[PDB]
Amino acid sequence: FGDFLTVMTQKMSEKDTKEEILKAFKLFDDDETGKISFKNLKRVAKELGENLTDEELQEMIDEADRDGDGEVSEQEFLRI
């Protein structure tokens, strides 16, 4: 989630170093369950500041889902 944040804002000097993985994922899951899938990445890509393409958001899922099934859960959020 750190590289997706810097990519969507486009300003390479903004806020945090650690802590941001827990604050960015918990403000992403509005239902409080704790599971981000590729469709919620589309909602946040448009609402942040500078939107990406379908293929580029899927490279962000592959770096985030190393121990999962195509979505980032609680175990890849706390692994920090």
| CATH code at position 21 | 1.10.238.10
**3 within a domain of the structure (yes/no):** no
Q: Is 55 annotated as a binding residue?
A: no
Q: Is 76 annotated as a binding residue?
A: yes
**6 within a domain of the structure (yes/no):** no
Q: How far is CA 24 from CA 2, 29, 41, 50, in A?
A: 8, 9, 12, 17
User: Within 10 Å of residue 35's Cβ, how many Cβ atoms?
Assistant: 15
Distance, in Å, from the CA atom of 71 to the CA atom of 37, rounded to the nearest integer, reads 4
Q: Is 62 annotated as a binding residue?
A: no
Residue 10 is classified by DSSP as: -
Distance, in Å, from the CA atom of 36 to the CA atom of 40, rounded to the nearest integer, reads 6
The position carrying tokens 């448009």 is 46
Experimental method: NMR
Q: Is 67 annotated as a binding residue?
A: yes
Looking at the structure of the chain, the number of domains it has is: 1
Q: Is 71 annotated as a binding residue?
A: yes
**1 within a domain of the structure (yes/no):** no
Give the structural domain span for 79. 14-80
Contacts 24+ apart (CB under 8 A), 14-23: 18/80, 21/77, 21/80, 22/77, 22/78, 22/80
